[PDB]
Design a protein around this ligand. Structure first.
Ligand SMILES: *[C@@H]1O[C@H](CO)[C@@H](O)[C@H](O)[C@H]1NC(C)=O
Ligand SMILES: *[C@@H]1O[C@H](CO)[C@@H](O)[C@H](O)[C@H]1NC(C)=O
Ligand SMILES: *[C@@H]1O[C@H](CO)[C@@H](O)[C@H](O)[C@H]1NC(C)=O
Lengths: 135, 119, 135, 135, 114
């Protein structure tokens, strides 16, 4: 296939990783060897271009899902960051957060979701995903 | 052995060592053997505090008043802005990302600190 | 037209189902006979491919908008699900939820949003929509 | 580049106006002279087509981020609108809102985000963005 | 050109009557053509729009009610429910009549006393 796109599923993070874990299971999508899931922690595009990256993080319990980006030869930064107010619910109350934008990615660049409370992100089927697609 | 590496403020690319851009300027095009690396000064609100090879500058930190911060020190094209709490407010963290409000009740606070106490 | 895309507007419902209703009114979009709005309850693509589907649901109060997918010859499933906790406010307080991801759809496959409290989804102009586009 | 796309960063308004301000700073993206940032208040596409427009607004303290659209020769309207509430935390308590949809834009058409409390939208790096991309 | 007609590349096509979206522009053999707005949409003005507007929604969750339907050239009109009132000039949301002096109305609020 010609189109570079990827959609990964969140996974029960081994333990101790402010940066979320993603697994190529479930109803995932990895168009081709032009987008890989390096170390199961980040997506790394091979062909430089303009991609639309996104990610949704669901947690329950000021929780912040940041989409820090790491390119070759440059200190990692911040593409987007979505904040969410702790919901005072009986056990905790589930809340979802969605990020998405158009960014210029050079070859070998990686993107990843980094949250403040990784022990809250709910991993139930379809609650937390991560993906990108090339414009 | 031969000198197998670029200089301090450089960066190997295309089997050719180029010059990095100076703090305050973002890279615009890599450099050829003869013509050096063309950079360009960071816009307003932006900056780059290091000999980089970045294509986008960083935006000056925001001292969102809603959180109780204030522009302590603007930012140049080579230094990010510096924030601090409002008089009567203090940080909720050592890095100081959000400000609270000096708790009353005996070491006076400094926003960047707190007000200790006892009877 | 060559590009397959669709954006439909939410509409109240006379039935009681938790499956949201969508109408081709307002500032809607239906690129061509390759994406139809079957029974006004779901979008059905004809050409197999890799689409980006999305949907925003705004309700006025553990509210959960799911994007269960129904493909031919396979039990419908779950593409995404976004949660939200019921917060208090004067009449009911409004809340929006956004879903979106890249998925592989085969011909005749349909997608649909399914919420927990269809009787809260606010249908005001531009609050609740649903759509997809083919990469 | 052949592809028309744009991603702009929010900027602390001065006119403290309903319409949000956007600056081409930070990790922004402006594919070419086919999408401009007219008056730093709106994005205007030149070639007519089907675009995917989106915007995320993070504020804190019935907050409503709308995406009113202004086309040449037509009263401006409403593409999308996302609502949300005020969760009294300590100082304000942030919250993010995301909008995105596929719309038919004719040449000279401009899109813009218009919020209810512009004095609350947080402008911290990567919190509030705005953009589009042509399908 | 002039009212009830707009201009394009060089020729002037006429608008569409208030109650019909625009479909295709005019040329050198045929003019601007338009189809009516749905049975939930409308256009209250000689427009050149490609999508009609959808009838306003009197969301009951907010305490509103269909005061007057909308034709293919007039938007619907909402109002509060008996026992409710608007929360500002524009009747965006309604609230239940606070009870415990002067009563309240569609937009009026009540006032108590001993
Ligand atoms: C995200 O990861 C970085 C390192 O990549 C870590 O230092 C940081 O604390 C994490 N979250 C953030 C951006 O605060
Ligand atoms: C999906 O629809 C089924 C049948 O209408 C319903 O039982 C279920 O609750 C819906 N999913 C939810 C709760 O979002
Ligand atoms: C912003 O847009 C909303 C709805 O589109 C409207 O209520 C408000 O008056 C607008 N603000 C202005 C006057 O720019």
């Amino acid at each position: 296939n010609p189109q570079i796109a990827a959609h990964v599923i969140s996974e029960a993070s081994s333990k101790t990783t402010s940066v979320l874990q993603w697994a190529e299971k479930g109803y995932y999508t990895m168009s081709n060897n032009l987008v890989t899931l390096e170390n199961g922690k980040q997506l790394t595009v091979k062909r430089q271009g303009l991609y639309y990256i996104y990610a949704q993080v669901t947690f329950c319990s000021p929780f912040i899902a940041s989409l820090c980006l790491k390119s070759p030869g440059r200190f990692e930064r911040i593409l987007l960051r979505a904040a969410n107010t702790h919901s005072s619910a009986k056990p905790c109350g589930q809340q979802s957060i969605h990020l998405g934008g158009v960014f210029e990615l050079q070859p070998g660049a990686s993107v990843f979701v980094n949250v403040t409370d990784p022990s809250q992100v709910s991993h139930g089927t379809g609650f937390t995903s991560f993906g990108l697609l090339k414009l | 052995e031969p000198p197998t590496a670029c200089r301090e403020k450089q960066y190997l690319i295309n089997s050719q060592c180029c010059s990095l851009c100076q703090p305050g300027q973002k890279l615009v095009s890599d450099c050829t053997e003869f013509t050096e690396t063309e950079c360009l000064p960071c816009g307003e609100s932006e900056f780059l505090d290091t000999w980089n090879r970045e294509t986008h500058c960083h935006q000056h930190k925001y001292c969102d008043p809603n959180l109780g911060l204030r522009v302590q020190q603007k930012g140049t094209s080579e230094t990010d802005t510096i924030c601090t709490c409002e008089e009567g407010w203090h940080c909720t963290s050592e890095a100081c990302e959000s400000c609270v409000l000096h708790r009353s009740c005996k070491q006076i606070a400094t926003g960047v600190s707190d007000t200790i106490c006892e009877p």
